[PDB]
Each structure stands twice: as C-alpha cells, then as structure tokens.
Design an enzyme around this catalytic site. Structure first.
Site, short mmCIF file in Angstrom:
data_model
loop_
_atom_site.label_atom_id
_atom_site.label_comp_id
_atom_site.label_asym_id
_atom_site.label_seq_id
_atom_site.Cartn_x
_atom_site.Cartn_y
_atom_site.Cartn_z
N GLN C 11 0.83 -1.20 0.00
CA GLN C 11 0.00 0.00 0.00
C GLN C 11 0.86 1.26 0.00
O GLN C 11 0.70 2.14 -0.85
CB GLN C 11 -0.95 -0.01 1.20
CG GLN C 11 -1.70 1.30 1.39
CD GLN C 11 -2.74 1.23 2.49
OE1 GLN C 11 -3.68 0.44 2.41
NE2 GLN C 11 -2.58 2.06 3.51
N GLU C 71 -3.27 -7.35 -2.56
CA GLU C 71 -4.70 -7.08 -2.67
C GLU C 71 -4.89 -5.91 -3.62
O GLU C 71 -3.96 -5.15 -3.89
CB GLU C 71 -5.33 -6.78 -1.30
CG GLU C 71 -4.77 -5.56 -0.59
CD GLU C 71 -5.83 -4.50 -0.34
OE1 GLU C 71 -6.75 -4.39 -1.17
OE2 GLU C 71 -5.73 -3.79 0.68
N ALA C 99 -1.21 -9.94 3.04
CA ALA C 99 -0.37 -10.69 3.96
C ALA C 99 -0.81 -10.57 5.41
O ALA C 99 -0.10 -11.06 6.30
CB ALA C 99 1.09 -10.24 3.82
N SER C 140 7.01 -0.31 2.42
CA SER C 140 7.00 -0.04 3.85
C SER C 140 7.73 -1.15 4.61
O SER C 140 7.90 -2.26 4.12
CB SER C 140 5.57 0.09 4.38
OG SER C 140 4.87 -1.15 4.33
N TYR C 224 -2.77 10.61 4.62
CA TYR C 224 -1.80 9.99 3.72
C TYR C 224 -1.50 10.89 2.53
O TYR C 224 -0.34 10.99 2.10
CB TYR C 224 -2.32 8.62 3.25
CG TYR C 224 -2.16 7.50 4.26
CD1 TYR C 224 -1.00 7.39 5.02
CD2 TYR C 224 -3.16 6.56 4.46
CE1 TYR C 224 -0.84 6.37 5.95
CE2 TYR C 224 -3.01 5.54 5.39
CZ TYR C 224 -1.85 5.45 6.13
OH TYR C 224 -1.69 4.43 7.06
N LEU C 252 22.44 5.52 -11.25
CA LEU C 252 22.20 4.91 -9.94
C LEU C 252 23.50 4.56 -9.23
O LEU C 252 23.56 4.59 -7.99
CB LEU C 252 21.33 3.67 -10.10
CG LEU C 252 19.95 3.92 -10.70
CD1 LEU C 252 19.21 2.61 -10.93
CD2 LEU C 252 19.14 4.84 -9.81
N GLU C 254 26.16 6.27 -9.02
CA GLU C 254 26.75 7.42 -8.34
C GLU C 254 26.28 7.54 -6.90
O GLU C 254 27.01 8.07 -6.05
CB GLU C 254 26.44 8.71 -9.10
CG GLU C 254 27.34 8.98 -10.29
CD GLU C 254 27.37 10.45 -10.69
OE1 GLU C 254 27.46 11.32 -9.79
OE2 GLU C 254 27.29 10.75 -11.90
#
Ligand SMILES: Nc1nc2c(ncn2[C@@H]2O[C@H](COP(=O)(O)OP(=O)(O)OP(=O)(O)O)[C@@H](O)[C@H]2O)c(=O)[nH]1
Ligand SMILES: Nc1ncnc2c1ncn2[C@@H]1O[C@H](COP(=O)(O)OP(=O)(O)CP(=O)(O)O)[C@@H](O)[C@H]1O
Ligand SMILES: COc1cc2c(cc1OS(N)(=O)=O)CCN(Cc1cc(Br)c(OC)c(OC)c1)C2
Ligand SMILES: Nc1nc2c(ncn2[C@@H]2O[C@H](COP(=O)(O)OP(=O)(O)O)[C@@H](O)[C@H]2O)c(=O)[nH]1
Ligand SMILES: [Ca+2]
Ligand SMILES: [Mg+2]
Ligand SMILES: [Mg+2]
Ligand SMILES: [Mg+2]
Lengths: 316, 54, 437, 422
Positions: C11, C71, C99, C140, C224, C252, C254
């Site tokens: 999410q 989901e 989960a 997260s 949020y 990337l 660097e």
C-alpha cells in the site's frame, strides 16, 4: 496527574525529589521500565536518550543533558578548554593541565616542566619530581582558615532548566580540613569528607556561607560576594555557555535539565580556581530540603505545573 | 575552502566544496528455503487433520 | 541514454508511487493523457526525461514503472485515477488476499505464488531498454507485503540482474501513523533479509513527516495524501538528476559512490527545507544561507535523531530554484563555525553540490506553497542508529515472552529465523558504534 | 478477504442473531424486503461483506439458521425482518437437545450436522474471497453449546485456512435455566480453546447487573439483555461493514489482538448504556472503560490488558478522541502490560448507530477474564465431586474421564491467564 520513573536507587538528591513528588498528590511513580512517562530520573551510565521523545501525546523530561560529560570527565574537560575558542586555553581560572596515556601530550608536559623545574613546582595526578589520567599544577599557595592553618574547597550547586537558564544555589558549603597544611602525609592535602573521617572546628568539617563570610569580614575586611562569588559566577557562566550549542534541547523532541556540582579552589590572593565539574553530586544534610524543593519548583513544575527565590539567575 | 569540477549547462550546474583532506544466494538455494517452509506448513496441517480424524 | 525502472510494493509503495509520478508529469509538461507538446522527437529520442518515460508512435509518454500489491484495493485507485491513461494494464499487478500484516505470509506463503509473474512483467520493461541502470523500490517496513514480498523480490532481482543497481525508499514505522502491533517484527525480518541485496536505501519515519505536516503546514490531523505529497517533494529532488540535464548523480551507481563507503551502512539521512504552508497568502522567502542552515535542525529531517552525537561519512546538497554557487559557499563557511559537524577521520570533510534552475513544482491547490528555492541534504551519519536501537528494543520487549510468534511459525517460518535476524541487527548496531566511537 | 458467512445455532443464538441483522439492515438502509432506500453511499460500499446481491437490486444476508427444534426459528421467520432471510438457509430438526451438551454434540446433533455443512459449502462456493465465519450461540444449553462446537470442529476440517469467530453467551445462576449449565459450559470452553480464533464473551451475569443497577430495571427480561447484546454486536462489526481508513477484517483482527493462541477470549464494552443530550468525547471514554460498562462480569482492575481496540461513531473531533484515549492509558498505565508496545488501537466512523448522536464500543483482551472461568469452574466441581446429575450424560455414551479432562483443561486456562498477569 503526572508520571515519572526511577532508574537510580543511589541518588540521595532525587530520592528526596521522588519522595517530595509523592507528597504532592499529583505525581505517581511507575515501574522503572515503563515507556509512558512524563519525567525520568534516569541512570548515570548508558542512559538511553535515543528512546526519549517518541511517545505520542507525552511531554517527556529527563534529569540529564546528553553530551554534558565533556564537562564532567577530567580528561574531556581538559580537552574542552584547550580546543574551545570560547575558552582558548588562555582563560585565567583553570590550572595548567595536560592529558597523558599509559592524541597524547606526554611530550608537551615535560617541556613546560623543564622551564618550571629550574625555578619550583609540584604537580598532582588522578583519574615535586616528574619521574614519580590528567596532570595539573598543584596549588602550592592556598587560602588557609585561622585558627588551624588549614585548607578547604568550595562546593557550589547550579541548576540548568530546559530553557537553559542558569540558576546558582544561594547556599554553598566549604569542605574544610582538620590538620594544618604541611608543604614538605596527605590528609592535610586532600579535602574530602570521607578522608577526613576530625570535626574539631566545625561539625562534619564543612563550613557554610554565613560563617565564612563573617570570617572574611573580620579577618580580611571583604565580603564573600566581591572576593570570590563574582569569579565563581563568571566560571559557571563561561563553561555552560560554551557547550550550549552541543547539548541544548531548545528544538529537540525531548527536554533536559541537570544539577551540577562545581568544586572551586581559592588562593591567598583571593583568586578563584575551578578544579572539576561533578555531574552526579550529593548535598549537605542542612540543605537537602531547601535545594530539592527548589529543583521541583524551577526544573520539574516549570514544565509540569500544578494547581524571594533561593537561586541567583545568572543572565546571559 | 576549495571548489572543484564546475559543470554548467542550460538546466543548472554542480561542483564540490572540500574543507579538509582525510586524516549472493542462487536461484536453487532460494527455492530450497521456499520449499522447506511449504513442507513445514504441510506437516503442521497433516497433524491437525490427523487430530480432527481422531 | 540509460533507463531506470521503478517498482512499488504494498500500500505505502503504491500510494507514494502515485504522488511521485503525478509530480513528474507536472515537472516535465506531460498531461494526464501522456501527450507532451514540448517533445518534438515523436516516437523516440535519447533525452534526459526518457530515462523514466518511453514513447509510443502516437506520442504517449509512458512511465517505466510497475505497481504490485497482494490485494487490489489500492491499485484500483491508479486504474481509475486522473493519470489512468498514463499506464498500461500490464504495469499494474494485484492479488486477492493480503499478507495480514504478517511478514512470513508475504514472503513464504503468498510470495512464492506470484514472484514469477512479477519478474516476467519486469522483464518486459527491461527488454525495451538499451542500457538499463537498475531499479528504484518503494515499500514499507511494517506491512506484511511491503516487508515480506519485497525481500523476496530483492533476492530474485540480484539473481536475474546481478550487475544492476537497486535503490530503496522505505517507510519506517511510527505509532502516530500505525497499522499493526507486530510492525517491529516485520521491520527486523525484512531488514535482515534485504541487506545484502540493496545498494542504497532512504528511510522516512512517519513520525517525522507527521510532525512536519502539523508544525509547518498547520494540519491538525495529517492524511496519507498530505504525507505523500511532502514525501514526493523529497523523492523528486533525489531523482531530479536522473531526469534532467546535469553532472551530479546522473546514474544509480553514483549514489553508492558518493554516499555509501561501507556496504552494510547504506542508510543516508535526508533533510528538506523549506516546507511552507500554502494557506499563507504571503511568506518571507528564505535565502540560500537560511535554508542550508535548516538542514542541520533535527525538526527538519526525515528520521528524528540528533546528528550532534554522531559522525559523518558523506554529504550531498541538492538545490532547486534561484540558486547560484557564490551563495552556497558563503552559507557553508557560515555553518562550519556555528554548529558541530564532525566527519570521520578517514573521510574528506566536503560537500557535493548540485543546482537545478527549475524551481520546485507543487500540485495546484495542494498544501505546499510555491517557493523560489529549496534544498534537500543527503548525509550518511551514524546518528541514524538511534532509530535502529528504538526499533530493536520494541522487538525485544515482545519477543521475550514469544508474543505473537505463533502467527509466523504457522506460515512455515522457524523460531530460529527470529533470533537470526535479531543477531544480525545486533551486529549492525555494533558496526555503527565502531564507526562513531 | 471480503465475504463473511454468518451462522446462528440454538435458542439464544437465533434470538441475538435475529436482532443483529435487524440492526445492521437499518444502518445500511435495507428494508425488510431486501430493497435499498438509503441516502448515502457509505452504506453500500462494503455491503457485500454481510449481504449477497440478487437480481433486481435485492440484498439478502449471508446467514445460516440452525436449531434442533423448530420453536425459535419459527418466531424469527415471523419477526420484523423474517422475510429477508434466504429460505434454503433454515436448517432445523425436531428432537431438541434438552439442555444437554452430549445430545447436541454426540447423539441428536450428529444427525443434522451434514445438512448444515451443505448450506455452508453452498455459500462459501459463491465467495470471491472468503474471510471466515462468525457464530452466535450460548454455552449453557444443548444445541448452541453442544452442536455449535461440533459444527466449529467440522468447519475447521473443510476450511482450515479461514478465520473462526464466535459470540458466546456465558451462563449465570442469576439468570439460570437448569442446574447443569456449568457442565455444558465447561465442556464447550474446552472446545473453544482449540477451534476458534476470536471469541466475544457475553456474560449473562453482567448483562443482568447492568439492567438492574444502571438502567434501573427491577425485573429484566431476555429482551432487555439482547438490547445490550445487539448494540455490542453492531459496535464490534462497524469496522468490518463501513469504508474507513482502518479497512479491518477478521484475520488482521486476530493477528493484532491475540498474542498467544489459547488466549483469544475478548471482553466487550459499550457506551452510552441506553436521552436527547449527546455525550461529550470525555464522557464516552470514561464510561467505555468503567466496570459498569463491561459485558463480562470481570473487574479489569483485577487484571491487565494484553490488547485493546475501540471504535467511535458520530461527528466528533479526532484530536479530542486522541487526547482522551492517551489520557486514560497514561492515567491507568498500571492495568496495561508493558511488553506489548502501542497495544491500544482507536478508530472513528462518521455514521452513528440509530438513535444516538455518537457512541463508543470497546474490545478487550484482559487477564481478568479468568474470574469468569473460575466462577464456572467452582460451580462445576461442587457438583462433580459428588457425581451429581452425571447420569444425564453417561446415558448418552459419555464417560467420567471426559469430564475430568474438560475440567482439567479449564483450570489450566485459568492458570495460563494468571501467568501473564504477573
Ligand atoms: N507515508 C505513508 N505511509 C504509509 C502509507 N500507507 C501505509 N503506510 C505505512 O505503512 C505501514 C503499513 O504497511 P502497508 O504498506 O499499509 O501494508 P502492505 O504493504 O500493504 O502489506 P499488507 O499487510 O498485506 O497490507 C504503516 O506503518 C503505515 O503507517 C502511505 O500512503 N504513506
Ligand atoms: N591542582 C590542585 N591544587 C590544589 N588542590 C587540589 C588540586 N587538585 C586536587 N586538589 C585537591 O584534591 C581534592 C580532590 O580532588 P578531585 O576533586 O580531583 O578528586 P575527586 O573528583 O575524586 C573528589 P570531588 O568529587 O569532590 O572533586 C580536592 O578537595 C582538592 O582540594
Ligand atoms: C491492539 O492493537 C491493534 C488492534 C488492531 C489493529 C492494529 C493494532 O495495533 S496498532 N495499535 O495499530 O499498532 C488493526 C486491526 N484492528 C481491527 C479493529 C476491529 C474493530 Br472491531 C475495532 O473496533 C472496536 C477496531 O478499533 C477501532 C479495530 C485491531
Ligand atoms: N442473553 C441471552 N441468553 C439466553 C437467551 N436465551 C437463552 N439464554 C441463556 O442460554 C442458556 C440456555 O441455552 P439455550 O440457548 O436456551 O439452549 P439451546 O437452545 O439448546 O441452545 C441459559 O444460560 C440462558 O440463560 C437470550 O435470548 N439471551
Ligand atoms: Ca523525444
Ligand atoms: Mg567526585
Ligand atoms: Mg495492504
Ligand atoms: Mg432455552
């Protein structure tokens, strides 16, 4: 009510603060490991500051300043004074000191000792000839109280609140000796209540301020405020204003206050010398009540209110 | 206080400011652990179904 | 021209992903239909913005992204959102059953059943690249998917793209914006399993974004949407170099070379300013010195901690707007005297600076006010280990009684993995103490 | 995680289950005929959780009604919302259970259980993503207690990866039907320890005390007690039925509220206790946590909370709700365990229950619940040590050993709660 925890059972000062808080009816003690608290009377060593100020809805206060040991460790205090441009070593109130290891300063201590030995000088060390930690010059010409021909040291209690106001307790204590000073035994050389124990001149070998100020008037024609206290107030201000940017909790997620114990030395020319700064000091029996209540009035209840002053505010 | 490597263009520039010089598991091993967890799940389920069977 | 692929998991990853891409299109002049009237090479090109957008023969500019969630509630927002026309259905992946805030359920049980599908969708994007740099991964710590499936994806990406770089944007858990009591468990399990597979990771503590939105934006109960539009500003300044012309952090690799000396200690601290409330019809515009000074105020950083009691290893300053080097050097010289900035003796005491003349972009009608100059600092300091100790202590409180552990075992995990991941966190805490003295 | 399947067994089970559907149908704007005549859309966004949709925009509950005698299910089919239930989902027999656990679990109940499973399977097969099951029943009778637990055991065998949730009514001598109620309740608790993920303990002794002392009802009726039960049931499903930041479901509930498998017996609470003056936020929080508002006759001050969950309904200040919850935690922190950080969860819903301008519902996993099992255990042993009334069960094939086992596991559960209280 308000919430506090206890994490140092050996604190004589805060044992009375935790007891006086319990006499308020508005403070209650929790288990030592309860995270939800307003005030912590935390442990001396390894206090986990990183876990403070993260509890939602809680304004958390603690009785220690993180980073304040730079001023209370003899090795770090020396380093602080030498490398701080605000002090710049050239300060006139701290004895010449050097730090050695068993970077090191063993090379620079022996250099200044050569210009000294040629003439006299006698040094002291803890944690006359140099061949026999930190090393500083021993004040060979102290101020002696008569009758008795004895030395002493001055203990001053200073309280710093969350706003970094500097409060100097009005009541000091002179921890005096009993044996005459002999500049040739180390009992007449080290001023400590435990080492002294004795008690012939004053009780507990500790002379308070009203008596010492009367001795200065009758014996020297001066007052405690002019001859000594001004210098003490200057040293207290200078040291605490130095580290302020490093320990200030003005914009931090938790707030700090801490009681300090400054130990000074006075010479025969009425010059004040700073010996060391104690971060966990005790107190005198005749002063446990007044001081501890002042802490709650100025330091604890200043953030957690309830339903002349004894401190001298050292402005800056 | 030295500035080095100034790179300009139409969108901006960049540089460096110096103040002081200085004083894997395989696919099978993954599948091995994944299939081990599925077996422990299968075992625990067989014991329940055996318990309900009694 | 080298392409970058973004991956959003769970999410938090998906919602933050929406915010970022909304801002990108604003900064690059791309409408919600994928049309870009400033682009004159229709159907192709090797411009700086093509690292994040490909082009179709009809003129659409499609992001090089993929959205994954066990989901479908959150990803359905994208398919019906303002920028629906931007993505292709194959880029959005959804399951049926999440989960349940359970690491083991996201890594083992449900992770094994969908890992191959996602890798095949990622392989389709890579095929359309000539010179792929790596991946940016959003997720997260606390969620069962963001922690459990992410660590499986990072294990497999290392296998299929061994030479490619992988950067993380992770959301560190906070009770002010909480979702589950076992978030400490999932945080440790995924940090232990992801560590060897991540080249550089930017943590954002929801407690810090929450306090900033309340203090600076005068928002009593932040949402949020508020949190993410502020997090997007941070992300946009970290990736601006990959999308615009420049010379600092243009690929990337660097990021590791300029921020990560030791592999395991690869969590730089981010700081941003100014965050000004758009409700103020006027606000004094801060100067270069002022906003640079704020990068060393604890209340402005993405992870609450005291940098005064740590040691620095690297530091990068990224400016956007009306900024010229002369002022940047003046501010730096000023800050070295006012504050305590101590590096490690085995690292140079310098700053890498980048300047983009296009000032920050803000969502119209949003909560952030338009400013004329802003700065984001990326510094790798040991002070960030405070956050590891806070989190490790909460893990120890619950684990001493084995509380909640049975939910993970029931998914095929063994108790030994708990102490294994915990001992690794103890070694990580020890490695910071060796560097900080 | 979407569809829930509801089941109600026995007299008590079908009476509280009936009032439950009557209440939530009203909150979602569903009339007795299954048609929708609401004004908002928040009542239709998650309606599939409890209702199936039939052609013609009709909403039919996803519920199954079970009983070993037809008396109670006839009254439901003739009640206010009797016409709303799917006719096939009525499963019942004729012999009854005689308030005898053995008859519901071993003899009479065994004949009927397969037919119930057929209906459950029919409902489950139509679910896009089935969460689990919820069951209403009492523990002091025969059908809901004896057969109810037999169903739980069989459902776990076919759907072992789904959540099992119950509303279980505890017997009390203050509102008693037969002297063997402690026997039946002790045998059911043993089953519940093994085969449910969450159990709400509704104590008939606490319901009676609330009606007598607080509501000032001299002679309370089962109708009065069920008014409290239906309010509690509506409160503890709000987060399942309405769109919110939470997005709760049965698995996340169990994951966050049950730290140890066996200790899954929750203590519910409600406020205000049912006139035109709405309550202030500080009033809700205070009442919600008072012993007089608990639905199980246990003193929370005699134990500690493992976890807590509370929902607030109405148009109020989130800031004020936070300020009041954090207040009660930090002013009663002695009754919370320290080794579970952030173990109090709060949420808000803008839709208030019918009649009230705002209310608050409480779910507690407290170690004080052991006082309930102690109460039932002492009543059990006083009869058992003289083998009193046992012939009613040994005549159904049971042996004395099976009683000694349920009693033994009951006392273990009590000592398990005492372990985590120290
Ligand atoms: N800043 C920010 N944090 C978020 C957001 N969404 C969730 N979080 C945080 O993420 C954590 C919860 O993990 P989720 O991402 O919601 O869970 P998940 O990855 O979907 O995995 P599941 O358990 O299967 O749902 C909490 O700590 C939240 O505070 C968001 O949109 N923005
Ligand atoms: N340079 C010096 N000149 C004169 N006296 C000194 C001195 N250094 C130390 N002393 C004496 O030694 C005594 C104790 O020294 P020091 O304070 O370093 O030990 P300590 O810290 O263990 C006891 P305290 O906590 O009271 O400071 C003091 O009372 C002081 O009189
Ligand atoms: C014990 O703590 C926690 C509890 C819970 C969660 C997370 C937690 O952990 S936490 N604090 O977020 O870290 C998420 C799932 N949730 C479900 C729920 C169902 C109902 Br019903 C409710 O109504 C009374 C409710 O409350 C409004 C919540 C319970
Ligand atoms: N709260 C409540 N309790 C009830 C109700 N009906 C019966 N009981 C209780 O349930 C127990 C008897 O079980 P009962 O449901 O009548 O037996 P069953 O029909 O065989 O399942 C006794 O303890 C009663 O006090 C009711 O409507 N409400
Ligand atoms: Ca082009
Ligand atoms: Mg000492
Ligand atoms: Mg999710
Ligand atoms: Mg009956």
């Amino acid at each position: 009510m308000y919430t506090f925890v206890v994490r140092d059972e050996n604190s004589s000062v805060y044992a009375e603060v935790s007891r006086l808080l319990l006499a308020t009816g508005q403070w209650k003690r929790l288990r030592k490991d309860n995270p939800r608290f307003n005030l912590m009377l935390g442990e001396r060593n390894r206090l986990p500051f990183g876990r403070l100020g993260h509890e939602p809805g809680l304004v958390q206060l603690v009785n220690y300043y993180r980073g304040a040991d730079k001023l209370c460790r003899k090795a770090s205090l020396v380093k602080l004074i030498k490398t701080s441009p605000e002090l710049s070593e050239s300060c006139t109130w701290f004895p010449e000191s050097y730090v050695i290891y068993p970077t090191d300063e063993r090379e620079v201590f022996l250099a200044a000792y050569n210009r000294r030995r040629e003439g006299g000088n006698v040094w002291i060390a803890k944690s006359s000839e140099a061949s026999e930690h930190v090393i500083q010059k021993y004040l060979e010409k102290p101020l002696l109280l008569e009758p008795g021909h004895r030395k002493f040291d001055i203990r001053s209690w200073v309280l710093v609140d969350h706003l970094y106001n500097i409060y100097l307790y009005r009541e000091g204590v002179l921890r005096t000796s009993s044996e005459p000073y002999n500049s040739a035994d180390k009992t007449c050389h080290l001023t400590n209540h435990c080492i002294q124990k004795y008690g012939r001149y004053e009780e507990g070998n500790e002379m308070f301020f009203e008596e010492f100020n009367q001795y200065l008037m009758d014996a020297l024609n001066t007052t405690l405020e002019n001859s000594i206290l001004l210098q003490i107030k200057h040293i207290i201000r200078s040291c605490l204003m130095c580290i302020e940017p490093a320990i200030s909790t003005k914009h931090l997620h938790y707030q700090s206050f801490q009681l300090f114990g400054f130990d000074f030395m006075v010479d025969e020319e009425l010059k004040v010398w700073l010996i060391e700064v104690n971060g966990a000091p005790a107190c005198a029996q005749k002063l446990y009540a007044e001081l501890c209540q002042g802490i709650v009035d100025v330091a604890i209840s200043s953030v957690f209110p309830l339903a002349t002053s004894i401190f001298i505010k050292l402005h800056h | 206080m030295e500035v080095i490597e100034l790179n300009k263009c139409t969108s901006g520039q960049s540089f460096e400011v110096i103040l002081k010089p200085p004083s894997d598991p395989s696919l099978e091993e993954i599948q091995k652990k994944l299939e081990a967890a599925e077996e422990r799940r299968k075992y625990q389920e067989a014991e329940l179904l055996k318990h309900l069977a009694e | 021209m080298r392409e970058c692929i973004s991956i959003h998991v769970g999410q938090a990853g998906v919602q933050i992903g929406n915010a970022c891409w909304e801002l990108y299109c604003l900064e690059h002049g791309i409408q919600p239909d994928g049309q870009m009237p400033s682009d004159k090479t229709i159907g192709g090109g090797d411009d700086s913005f093509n690292t994040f957008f490909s082009e179709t023969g009809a003129g659409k500019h499609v992001p090089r992204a993929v959205f994954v969630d066990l989901e479908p509630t959150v990803i359905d927002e994208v398919r019906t959102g303002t920028y629906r026309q931007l993505f292709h259905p194959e880029q959005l992946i959804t399951g049926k059953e999440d989960a349940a805030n359970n690491y083991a359920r996201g890594h083992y049980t449900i992770g094994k059943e969908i890992i191959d599908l996602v890798l095949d969708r990622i392989r389709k994007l890579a095929d359309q690249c000539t010179g792929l740099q790596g991946f940016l991964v959003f997720h997260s710590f606390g969620g069962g998917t963001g922690s459990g499936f992410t660590s499986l994806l990072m294990e497999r990406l290392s296998v299929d793209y061994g030479k490619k770089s992988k950067l993380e944007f992770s959301i560190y858990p906070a009770p002010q914006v909480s979702t589950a009591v076992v978030e400490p468990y999932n945080s440790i399990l995924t940090t232990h399993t992801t560590l060897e597979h991540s080249d550089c990771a930017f943590m954002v503590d929801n407690e810090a974004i929450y306090d900033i939105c309340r203090r600076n934006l005068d928002i009593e109960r932040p949402t949020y949407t508020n949190l993410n539009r502020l997090i997007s500003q941070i992300v946009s300044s970290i990736t601006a170099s990959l999308r615009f012309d420049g010379a600092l952090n243009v690929d990337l690799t660097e990021f590791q070379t300029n921020l990560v000396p030791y592999p395991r200690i690869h969590f730089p601290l981010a700081t941003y300013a100014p965050v000004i409330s758009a409700e103020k019809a006027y606000h004094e515009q801060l100067s270069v010195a002022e906003i640079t000074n704020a990068c060393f105020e604890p209340a402005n950083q993405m992870v609450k901690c005291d940098p005064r009691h740590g040691k620095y290893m690297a530091c990068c300053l990224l400016y956007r707007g009306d900024v010229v080097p002369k002022d940047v050097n003046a501010a730096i010289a000023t800050i070295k005297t006012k504050r305590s900035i101590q590096f490690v003796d085995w690292c140079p005491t310098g700053f890498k600076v980048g300047i983009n003349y296009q000032p920050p972009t803000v969502v119209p009608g949003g909560d952030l006010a338009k400013v004329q100059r802003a700065v984001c600092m990326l510094s790798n300091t040991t002070a960030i280990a405070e956050a590891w100790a806070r989190l490790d202590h909460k893990f120890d409180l619950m684990y001493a009684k084995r509380a909640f552990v049975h939910w993970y075992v029931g998914e095929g995990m063994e108790e030994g993995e708990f102490s294994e991941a915990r001992e690794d966190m103890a070694a990580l805490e020890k490695d910071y103490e060796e560097v900080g003295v | 995680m979407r569809e829930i399947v509801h089941i109600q067994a026995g007299q008590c089970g079908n009476q509280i289950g009936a009032k439950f559907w009557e209440v939530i149908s009203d909150e979602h704007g569903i009339d007795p005929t299954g048609s929708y005549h609401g004004d908002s859309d928040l009542q239709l966004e998650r309606i599939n959780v409890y209702y199936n949709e039939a052609t013609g925009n009709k909403y039919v509950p996803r519920a199954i009604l079970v009983d070993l005698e037809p008396g109670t299910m006839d009254s439901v089919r003739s009640g206010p919302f009797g016409q709303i239930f799917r006719p096939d989902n009525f499963v019942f027999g004729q012999s009854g259970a005689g308030n005898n656990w053995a008859k519901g679990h071993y003899t009479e109940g065994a004949e009927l259980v397969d037919s119930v499973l057929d209906v459950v399977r029919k409902e489950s097969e139509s679910c896009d993503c089935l969460q689990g099951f919820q069951l209403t029943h009492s523990l002091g009778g025969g059908t809901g207690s004896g057969m109810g637990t037999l169903l739980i055991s069989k459902i776990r065998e076919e759907y072992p990866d789904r959540i099992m949730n119950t509303f279980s009514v505890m017997p009390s001598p203050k509102v008693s039907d037969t002297v063997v109620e402690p026997y039946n309740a002790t045998l059911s608790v043993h089953q519940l320890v093994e085969n449910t993920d969450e159990t709400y303990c509704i104590d008939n002794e606490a319901l009676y005390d609330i009606c007598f002392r607080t509501l000032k009802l001299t002679t309370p009726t089962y109708g009065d007690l069920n008014h409290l039960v239906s309010a509690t049931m509506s409160g503890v499903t709000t987060c399942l039925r309405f769109p919110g930041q939470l997005n709760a479901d049965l698995r996340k509930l169990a994951v966050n509220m049950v730290p140890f498998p066996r200790l899954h017996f929750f203590m519910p609470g409600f406020a205000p206790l049912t006139q035109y003056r709405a309550l202030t936020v500080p009033e809700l929080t205070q009442q919600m946590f008072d012993s007089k508002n608990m639905m199980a006759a246990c003193d929370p001050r005699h134990g500690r909370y493992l976890t807590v969950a509370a929902i607030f309904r109405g148009r109020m200040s989130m800031k004020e709700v936070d300020e009041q919850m954090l207040n009660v935690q930090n002013k009663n922190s002695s009754y919370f365990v320290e080794w579970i950080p952030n173990n109090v969860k709060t949420a808000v819903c803008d839709i208030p229950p019918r009649g009230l301008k705002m209310s608050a519902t409480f779910i507690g996993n407290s170690t004080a619940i052991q006082e309930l099992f102690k109460r039932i255990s002492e009543q059990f042993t006083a009869m058992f040590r003289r083998k009193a009334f046992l012939h009613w069960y040994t005549g159904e094939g049971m042996d004395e050993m099976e009683f000694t086992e349920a009693e033994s596991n009951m006392n273990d559960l009590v000592s398990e709660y005492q372990q985590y209280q120290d």
